[PDB]
Design a protein around this ligand. Sequence first.
Ligand SMILES: [K+]
Ligand SMILES: [K+]
Ligand SMILES: [K+]
Ligand SMILES: [K+]
Ligand SMILES: [K+]
Ligand SMILES: [K+]
Ligand SMILES: [K+]
Ligand SMILES: [K+]
Ligand SMILES: [K+]
Ligand SMILES: [K+]
Ligand SMILES: [K+]
Ligand SMILES: [K+]
Ligand SMILES: [K+]
Ligand SMILES: [K+]
Ligand SMILES: [K+]
Ligand SMILES: [K+]
Ligand SMILES: [K+]
Ligand SMILES: [K+]
Ligand SMILES: [K+]
Ligand SMILES: [K+]
Ligand SMILES: [K+]
Ligand SMILES: [Mg+2]
Ligand SMILES: [Mg+2]
Ligand SMILES: [Mg+2]
Ligand SMILES: [Mg+2]
Ligand SMILES: [Mg+2]
Ligand SMILES: [Mg+2]
Ligand SMILES: [Mg+2]
Ligand SMILES: [Mg+2]
Ligand SMILES: [Mg+2]
Ligand SMILES: [Mg+2]
Ligand SMILES: [Mg+2]
Ligand SMILES: [Mg+2]
Ligand SMILES: [Mg+2]
Ligand SMILES: [Mg+2]
Ligand SMILES: [Mg+2]
Ligand SMILES: [Mg+2]
Ligand SMILES: [Mg+2]
Ligand SMILES: [Mg+2]
Ligand SMILES: [Mg+2]
Ligand SMILES: [Mg+2]
Ligand SMILES: [Mg+2]
Ligand SMILES: [Mg+2]
Ligand SMILES: [Mg+2]
Ligand SMILES: [Mg+2]
Ligand SMILES: [Mg+2]
Ligand SMILES: [Mg+2]
Ligand SMILES: [Mg+2]
Ligand SMILES: [Mg+2]
Ligand SMILES: [Mg+2]
Ligand SMILES: [Mg+2]
Ligand SMILES: [Mg+2]
Ligand SMILES: [Mg+2]
Ligand SMILES: [Mg+2]
Ligand SMILES: [Mg+2]
Ligand SMILES: [Mg+2]
Ligand SMILES: [Mg+2]
Ligand SMILES: [Mg+2]
Ligand SMILES: [Mg+2]
Ligand SMILES: [Mg+2]
Ligand SMILES: [Mg+2]
Ligand SMILES: [Mg+2]
Ligand SMILES: [Mg+2]
Ligand SMILES: [Mg+2]
Ligand SMILES: [Mg+2]
Ligand SMILES: [Mg+2]
Ligand SMILES: [Mg+2]
Ligand SMILES: [Mg+2]
Ligand SMILES: [Mg+2]
Ligand SMILES: [Mg+2]
Ligand SMILES: [Mg+2]
Ligand SMILES: [Mg+2]
Ligand SMILES: [Mg+2]
Ligand SMILES: [Mg+2]
Ligand SMILES: [Mg+2]
Ligand SMILES: [Mg+2]
Ligand SMILES: [Mg+2]
Ligand SMILES: [Mg+2]
Ligand SMILES: [Mg+2]
Ligand SMILES: [Mg+2]
Ligand SMILES: [Mg+2]
Ligand SMILES: [Mg+2]
Ligand SMILES: [Mg+2]
Ligand SMILES: [Mg+2]
Ligand SMILES: [Mg+2]
Ligand SMILES: [Mg+2]
Ligand SMILES: [Mg+2]
Ligand SMILES: [Mg+2]
Ligand SMILES: [Mg+2]
Ligand SMILES: [Mg+2]
Ligand SMILES: [Mg+2]
Ligand SMILES: [Mg+2]
Ligand SMILES: [Mg+2]
Ligand SMILES: [Mg+2]
Lengths: 207, 54, 118, 123, 114
Amino acid sequence: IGLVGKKVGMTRIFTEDGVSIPVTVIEVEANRVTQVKDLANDGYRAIQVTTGAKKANRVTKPEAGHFAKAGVEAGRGLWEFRLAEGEEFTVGQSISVELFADVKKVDVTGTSKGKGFAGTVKRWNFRTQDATHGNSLSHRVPGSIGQNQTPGKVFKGKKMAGQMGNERVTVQSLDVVRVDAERNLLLVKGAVPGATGSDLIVKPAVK
Amino acid sequence: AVQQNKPTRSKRGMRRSHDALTAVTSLSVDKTSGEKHLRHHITADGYYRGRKVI
Amino acid sequence: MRHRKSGRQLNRNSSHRQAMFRNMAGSLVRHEIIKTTLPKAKELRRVVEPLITLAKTDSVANRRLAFARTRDNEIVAKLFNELGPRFASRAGGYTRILKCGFRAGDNAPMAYIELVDR
Amino acid sequence: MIQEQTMLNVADNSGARRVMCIKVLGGSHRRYAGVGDIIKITIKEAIPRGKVKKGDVLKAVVVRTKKGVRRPDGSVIRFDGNACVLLNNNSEQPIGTRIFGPVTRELRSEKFMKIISLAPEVL
Amino acid sequence: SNIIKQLEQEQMKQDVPSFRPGDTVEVKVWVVEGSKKRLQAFEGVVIAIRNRGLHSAFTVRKISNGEGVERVFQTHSPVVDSISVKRRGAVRKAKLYYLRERTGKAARIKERLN
RNA sequence: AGGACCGAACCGACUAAUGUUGAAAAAUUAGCGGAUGACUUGUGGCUGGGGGUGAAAGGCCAAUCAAACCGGGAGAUAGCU
RNA sequence: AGCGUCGAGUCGGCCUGCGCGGAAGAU
RNA sequence: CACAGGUGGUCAGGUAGAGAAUACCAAGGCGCUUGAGAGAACUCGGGUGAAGGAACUAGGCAAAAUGGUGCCGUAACUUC
RNA sequence: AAUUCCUUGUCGGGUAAGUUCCGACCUGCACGAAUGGCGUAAUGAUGGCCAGGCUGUCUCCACCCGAGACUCAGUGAAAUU
RNA sequence: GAUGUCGGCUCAUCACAUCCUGGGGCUGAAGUAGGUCCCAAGGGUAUGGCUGUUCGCCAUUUAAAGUGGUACGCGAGCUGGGUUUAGAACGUCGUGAGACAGUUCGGUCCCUAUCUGCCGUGGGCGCUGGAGAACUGAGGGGGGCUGCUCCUAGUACGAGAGGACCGGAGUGGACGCAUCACUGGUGUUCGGGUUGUCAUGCCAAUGGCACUGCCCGGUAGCUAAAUGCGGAAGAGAUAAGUGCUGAAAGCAUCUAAGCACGAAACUUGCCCCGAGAUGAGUUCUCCCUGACCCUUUAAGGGUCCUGAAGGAACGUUGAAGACGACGACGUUGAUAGGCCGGGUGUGUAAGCGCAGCGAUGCGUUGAGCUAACCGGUACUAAUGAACCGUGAGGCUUAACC
Ligand SMILES: [K+]
Ligand SMILES: [K+]
Ligand SMILES: [K+]
Ligand SMILES: [K+]
Ligand SMILES: [K+]
Ligand SMILES: [K+]
Ligand SMILES: [K+]
Ligand SMILES: [K+]
Ligand SMILES: [K+]
Ligand SMILES: [K+]
Ligand SMILES: [K+]
Ligand SMILES: [K+]
Ligand SMILES: [K+]
Ligand SMILES: [K+]
Ligand SMILES: [K+]
Ligand SMILES: [K+]
Ligand SMILES: [K+]
Ligand SMILES: [K+]
Ligand SMILES: [K+]
Ligand SMILES: [K+]
Ligand SMILES: [K+]
Ligand SMILES: [Mg+2]
Ligand SMILES: [Mg+2]
Ligand SMILES: [Mg+2]
Ligand SMILES: [Mg+2]
Ligand SMILES: [Mg+2]
Ligand SMILES: [Mg+2]
Ligand SMILES: [Mg+2]
Ligand SMILES: [Mg+2]
Ligand SMILES: [Mg+2]
Ligand SMILES: [Mg+2]
Ligand SMILES: [Mg+2]
Ligand SMILES: [Mg+2]
Ligand SMILES: [Mg+2]
Ligand SMILES: [Mg+2]
Ligand SMILES: [Mg+2]
Ligand SMILES: [Mg+2]
Ligand SMILES: [Mg+2]
Ligand SMILES: [Mg+2]
Ligand SMILES: [Mg+2]
Ligand SMILES: [Mg+2]
Ligand SMILES: [Mg+2]
Ligand SMILES: [Mg+2]
Ligand SMILES: [Mg+2]
Ligand SMILES: [Mg+2]
Ligand SMILES: [Mg+2]
Ligand SMILES: [Mg+2]
Ligand SMILES: [Mg+2]
Ligand SMILES: [Mg+2]
Ligand SMILES: [Mg+2]
Ligand SMILES: [Mg+2]
Ligand SMILES: [Mg+2]
Ligand SMILES: [Mg+2]
Ligand SMILES: [Mg+2]
Ligand SMILES: [Mg+2]
Ligand SMILES: [Mg+2]
Ligand SMILES: [Mg+2]
Ligand SMILES: [Mg+2]
Ligand SMILES: [Mg+2]
Ligand SMILES: [Mg+2]
Ligand SMILES: [Mg+2]
Ligand SMILES: [Mg+2]
Ligand SMILES: [Mg+2]
Ligand SMILES: [Mg+2]
Ligand SMILES: [Mg+2]
Ligand SMILES: [Mg+2]
Ligand SMILES: [Mg+2]
Ligand SMILES: [Mg+2]
Ligand SMILES: [Mg+2]
Ligand SMILES: [Mg+2]
Ligand SMILES: [Mg+2]
Ligand SMILES: [Mg+2]
Ligand SMILES: [Mg+2]
Ligand SMILES: [Mg+2]
Ligand SMILES: [Mg+2]
Ligand SMILES: [Mg+2]
Ligand SMILES: [Mg+2]
Ligand SMILES: [Mg+2]
Ligand SMILES: [Mg+2]
Ligand SMILES: [Mg+2]
Ligand SMILES: [Mg+2]
Ligand SMILES: [Mg+2]
Ligand SMILES: [Mg+2]
Ligand SMILES: [Mg+2]
Ligand SMILES: [Mg+2]
Ligand SMILES: [Mg+2]
Ligand SMILES: [Mg+2]
Ligand SMILES: [Mg+2]
Ligand SMILES: [Mg+2]
Ligand SMILES: [Mg+2]
Ligand SMILES: [Mg+2]
Ligand SMILES: [Mg+2]
Ligand SMILES: [Mg+2]
Ligand SMILES: [Mg+2]
């Protein structure tokens, strides 16, 4: 499994050898198991977790009953983690950042920052045409988008302008710099997806 | 760039399937005057949430 | 993108916006209620309410800083003599915005902006 | 951050005064040489009676850059000019007998220890 | 926010001495030859300060064997062992980048009498 | 003194971008040339179509030019569509 | 054929029916 | 066309300036007959840019640059 | 060579590298003496070539300020079929 | 009654007759390195000088600088150097007008996208009572490059010279994704310096205008040159190829039966989309338990009563965004603005005092001011409602109770 945390921000750890490690600080508060899924009922093995805290009134009756069945306080969302053969948890069990105490590498999944409607220069690293030398209205424009009568169409997956970012992104194999049960902190080396305050999924590195 | 064929009255109407105007969901009723008004807006007679403002 | 940016451009250059908000801030301190477009009214609070804050502490410095930001000694006088003392115990929120529908000529969303104790 | 056409000053007594980078060596489409990278150079200006002549094509190691060098704590060392030490084309050993101005500790390999040794300062 | 504050606070050197742009500082930095650790002095003019908590930095310019050298130190780095202010300079500006275009007599800074 | 020099008005039109169902059936913007002369400009006059006028480009002769425009021969003729 | 021995087939052409390889191309 | 064009003459303030250039003003005249929001791509017109500096390109096209007054000083060549 | 087809002639210069350029050679396909020959200071929005300065021309683009584009209200075209 | 033509630029896409990387047989293959043939299309596959060039030659790289198809791919995407209008000249031909599969200088590149296509993004209805969530994964897409160094080992091999396989570790190039902690760029919303001028009565102090007047710094954000991460290992089935056992054919034979191995290709493993997957799936939770009339009586049509869960709407908004959408928040409230404290940036405000003939200096004073930042704080605006959505959800058959 992994744990759901929040992106606090970035800072550094100065080591004794005079190395400055860039860290992302991840607030990993207690993940409370809301539902255990099994091969009999659900067809697969997983735990559903919640974390954080939700306003008493903005929890709907359908959502409130789901939390009420577990015997857990409502958190800000629900997330699943697939279980391996070895693992077992119970409904209501808390899992803390201490799960990662002996984990050396993590994959961190977030929602990337939203860039809105991006052109092909920004989105796909297309080269600009001439700034000068007679170029008419075609500086950052895409250029050609196909051939001729053969094939007489544009192929699917053609790189064009459109929505960029605001999507799920994993960054793999980030070194765990520090675990801190006391302050509910996981520090990982380097950048992770998403804005400050965004939800992050952290799992032990698959590679 | 221009059409090679005249589009139909059918296709015209299909495009205009999204042009329909939406009515105001409901009007709000002022506390004091009892004048109906646009919600979060001041009434025609200068009341808002039961207070003479203008 | 405009991530974390503040300020409306209002289809103006920066010199125009500054001049307009100076004129409009004056107008509001004089009359105490003005009707404007909802985004202009919303922006006017970010100019006006600092001027009233500055007017709470009547010094020669603050009067010149007020005059810099208004260019109207009549407006400066009302800030320091009337509004500053009027709003002394109040911690910001010297103005309120009340929406008042739509302008006939261009369907602009309009609003009143007034001083709260008017 | 040196590329093709970049003019470099010379930090040795080979006889060259100004050299032009004509190739950043060590990979396809490689854009830049920084401190410690070997470049191919042409000599544009030389002293009357050095070991090298104007128009000679040989190698050099970049020893100072304006872009500079980052250190593991996040610090930077920037120089006021770009400078290199001329190397023999085949051997890649320094042609000159002396080194002028400071070098960086990035040159500490097996390779450039003559330069390290001869330099007045290492940063 | 408050979390990063506390993470950062506990790494900040409490004994960073006071200095300003125009001051001649000597920065003693640790230098490693395998295991042999020694202090190398870097003395010159402070031309810029970035005050930014743990992420504080300062830029020291010196002319070094005929060549101008700027080093940007990270203030709370263990690399920087000590900072001694040697002279106090009297400048107006926060950033003295204009000294990059000056040499010798032009680049002299009047001493700050206090 | 000057078909002298630098440079506004004024007269031009070398380059580029824009514009190209234009703001404009030839322009705008930034630069560009001449600027006391073989200069430029107002008003009026004269030269008429195989004719004019031309520091000559077949240029120009009312947004028309290797033979103007209008009317007429005239429903030219069209082994072509 | 394997090899003195062991026990029934064994050898290479001819003609001919049908197959095999020779046989790499661009949405 | 209530059209960024074209159209001869006359008048000529202040400060700075060689000036009828240019900047800011006076007298006087006007804000150009759709507005309101938003602050994507892309296009247009601009500003700034690490390191490099013509490697761009048919071509340094475009841009960047130079830019004033006084004084010092100034080559080949020349019809002086 | 504003002339040379063969031709990027050959040799020299410049460049790391020069079908262009400059200087030569003469093998002038197919120069040549007022449909002028050769030279020439000065002049040129003239053609070619080189250098210094300079730079977003480029490596390789980034950000920002404005006008459109986008949304709302009013008015309301076009080629084509 | 028009299918724009060379070369470049931008963007490609396919073939394999493979340039590199991978696998392998033979060699006149000791090793290293070659030659030749077979398999293999996963990914990768120079910058410059000259020339309109494609090309070519040259310089210097690289693991390599592949060959072709795509209207000699791509001008409703750009260019316009070549070439083929009108000007002009040279050589040449011609008595000449003129002409040249000669040369030379100059010489307008239009289109607001209806349809298909493609990139993004919504609205509708469906999925069989309605609703809020979490999912499964049919299927689809992305990714797949490689140098050098060190160890193994100066070991095998070799007379020496030189010098490995196999295996392992490090560090790069190019490419991609994310991010802004650091280094920087930008920062016409912050601070300051300064020229000309106009004004605020004047001084002092300020503001306007002059490209943000010109500049110097710089916060947040955005961002690359900044710094984190990636390509995989592994698994399955194989290609060329190598075999085991093994007859047909007493022998032999990798093959006919049977069995093993074998590559960046293939199927997975990694990442992302994904139930309109109409084959519309699953799991968890929530909600609605009135009366009555009519008649061609049927999955029928009304009246009154009722109005849930939830949704929407409106408002304050966002590191979300063209608009829709998506997320936060609406007083039982930190959603935004303001305000308070801090930080950051600029660099010692004004006023007054003191020194000086004065410009100006010094003190008060690291002052004043300070955007988008951080921590807080109900002062202002997020309103009581109203609106949409209903009232236990077909038939058959089966199993069971
Ligand atoms: K005639
Ligand atoms: K000839
Ligand atoms: K003659
Ligand atoms: K000339
Ligand atoms: K191709
Ligand atoms: K082989
Ligand atoms: K391949
Ligand atoms: K064609
Ligand atoms: K073309
Ligand atoms: K076409
Ligand atoms: K076009
Ligand atoms: K069609
Ligand atoms: K940054
Ligand atoms: K920044
Ligand atoms: K002023
Ligand atoms: K479904
Ligand atoms: K969207
Ligand atoms: K607030
Ligand atoms: K002071
Ligand atoms: K003061
Ligand atoms: K301060
Ligand atoms: Mg965004
Ligand atoms: Mg490019
Ligand atoms: Mg054009
Ligand atoms: Mg353009
Ligand atoms: Mg087809
Ligand atoms: Mg519509
Ligand atoms: Mg904000
Ligand atoms: Mg507008
Ligand atoms: Mg201005
Ligand atoms: Mg003259
Ligand atoms: Mg003319
Ligand atoms: Mg002009
Ligand atoms: Mg002249
Ligand atoms: Mg002149
Ligand atoms: Mg002619
Ligand atoms: Mg005419
Ligand atoms: Mg005739
Ligand atoms: Mg007749
Ligand atoms: Mg007829
Ligand atoms: Mg056959
Ligand atoms: Mg008008
Ligand atoms: Mg007019
Ligand atoms: Mg005139
Ligand atoms: Mg005047
Ligand atoms: Mg003027
Ligand atoms: Mg814009
Ligand atoms: Mg600029
Ligand atoms: Mg630059
Ligand atoms: Mg700068
Ligand atoms: Mg620079
Ligand atoms: Mg330079
Ligand atoms: Mg040059
Ligand atoms: Mg070039
Ligand atoms: Mg080129
Ligand atoms: Mg130019
Ligand atoms: Mg310029
Ligand atoms: Mg020739
Ligand atoms: Mg050149
Ligand atoms: Mg030659
Ligand atoms: Mg050239
Ligand atoms: Mg010659
Ligand atoms: Mg002749
Ligand atoms: Mg004669
Ligand atoms: Mg003659
Ligand atoms: Mg046709
Ligand atoms: Mg093959
Ligand atoms: Mg492929
Ligand atoms: Mg394939
Ligand atoms: Mg594969
Ligand atoms: Mg080439
Ligand atoms: Mg073609
Ligand atoms: Mg092709
Ligand atoms: Mg075009
Ligand atoms: Mg086309
Ligand atoms: Mg041409
Ligand atoms: Mg002609
Ligand atoms: Mg930051
Ligand atoms: Mg900076
Ligand atoms: Mg700035
Ligand atoms: Mg006055
Ligand atoms: Mg004064
Ligand atoms: Mg004025
Ligand atoms: Mg004015
Ligand atoms: Mg100023
Ligand atoms: Mg594998
Ligand atoms: Mg056998
Ligand atoms: Mg590989
Ligand atoms: Mg504050
Ligand atoms: Mg400070
Ligand atoms: Mg000030
Ligand atoms: Mg002091
Ligand atoms: Mg806040
Ligand atoms: Mg309420």
